[PDB]
């Protein structure tokens, strides 16, 4: 697709999130770069409103799958790049086992050379002594397969996966992505993305933050 040509090199990224979980409002901003040729994302996130009222790892999935590396034989299945530069809307619900849920809406699109992911998140029904509001999560390495199928009536895709974070907390993620523009997109055969991520800290950063390194690779079609 033509969208694909936009990702041939290193692309700067801006990520922005306004959130409200059980009435606790906050905001996060992040920046870095993506290199789809390697499926590689490197980002640093800051909580601009002070202390994050939820654990950083619970926000990773919310905080740009257009940077996935699609092998050559699968490139006709890359919906995400095909929707660019006009972009796509990503809507998710995340159901935390025995606890609350997040509902999110994001617009992912190019603003000139910058890929911008602008998000709103609302979280409800969380328990005060649950794992999310009680901040009980580890902060290490994860790998999850992200399953994708076409949603042809909406000219987009439907996505599902599970996460697990050690305290273990389970979450079911359900996602729908729809193009912003009216032009043609690639509607994929069923496949999945390997999503491998590592969180860390910047030793010189005083603000509440997260450094993220992520490698995303499409698979599941022989």
The residues that touch Zn ion, with contacts defined as CB under 5 A, are 55, 120, 135, 143, 163, 165, 171, 194
At its nearest, how many Å lie between Cl ion and the CB of residue 60? Answer: 14
Question: How near is the Cβ of 213 to Cl ion at its closest, in Å?
Answer: 15
Give the nearest distance from C-beta 7 to Zn ion in angstroms. 21
Chain positions 183 to 222 lying near Cl ion, rule: CB under 5 A, are 194
- Contacts of Cl ion in 30-69 (CB under 5 A): none
Q: Is residue 164 near Cl ion by the rule CB under 5 A?
A: no
DSSP summary character for residue 187: P
Q: In 10-158, which residue ranges form alpha helices assigned H by DSSP? A: 79-82
Tokens linked to 7 = 């990702």
SS3 68: coil
Cβ–Cβ under 8 Å, residues 81 and 117: no
> Distance between CA 37 and CA 96 in Å, rounded?
33
Residue 23 Ramachandran class (φ > 0 left, ψ -120 to 50 alpha, else beta): left
Q: Which does 135 bind (CB under 5 to 8 A by kind): Zn ion, Cl ion, none?
A: Zn ion
Q: How far is the CB of 161 from Cl ion (least distance, A)?
A: 9
Selection from Zn ion, Cl ion, none that 55 binds (CB < 5 to 8 A by kind) is Zn ion
Cα dihedral: 97, 98, 99, 105 (round 10) = 30
How many C-beta neighbours within 10 Å does residue 98 have?
9
Contacting Cl ion within 67-96 (CB under 5 A): none
Report the SS3 class of residue 50. Answer: coil
Compare residues 25 and 135 and give the one whose CB is closer to Zn ion: 135
Contact between 143 and Cl ion per CB under 5 A: yes
Among the listed residues 145, 154, 164, 201, the single contact to Cl ion using CB under 5 A: 145
Question: Rounded to the nearest whole angstrom, what is the least distance from the CB of residue 190 to Zn ion in the complex?
Answer: 17
| Binding interface with Cl ion (CB under 5 A) | 143, 145, 194
């Amino acid at each position: 697709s033509k969208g694909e040509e936009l990702f041939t090199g290193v692309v700067p990224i801006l990520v922005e999130l306004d959130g409200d979980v059980n009435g606790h409002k906050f905001s996060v901003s992040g920046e870095g770069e993506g290199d789809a040729t390697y499926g590689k994302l490197t980002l640093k996130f800051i909580c601009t409103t002070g202390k994050l009222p939820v654990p950083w790892p619970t926000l990773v999935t919310t905080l740009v799958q257009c940077f996935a590396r699609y092998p050559d034989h699968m490139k006709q299945h890359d919906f995400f790049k095909s929707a660019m530069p006009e972009g796509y809307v990503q809507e998710r619900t995340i159901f935390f086992k025995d606890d609350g849920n997040y509902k999110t809406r994001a617009e992912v699109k190019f603003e000139g050379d910058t890929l911008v992911n602008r998000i709103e998140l609302k979280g409800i029904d969380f328990k005060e002594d649950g794992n999310i509001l009680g901040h009980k999560l580890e902060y290490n390495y994860n790998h999850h397969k992200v399953y994708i199928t076409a949603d042809k009536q909406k000219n987009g895709i439907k996505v599902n996966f599970k996460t697990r974070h050690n305290i273990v907390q389970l979450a079911d993620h359900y996602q729908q992505n729809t193009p912003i523009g009216d032009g043609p997109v690639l509607l994929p055969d069923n496949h999945y993305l390997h999503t491998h991520s590592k969180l860390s800290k910047d030793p010189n950063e005083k603000r509440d933050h997260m450094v993220l390194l992520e490698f995303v690779t499409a698979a599941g079609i022989t």
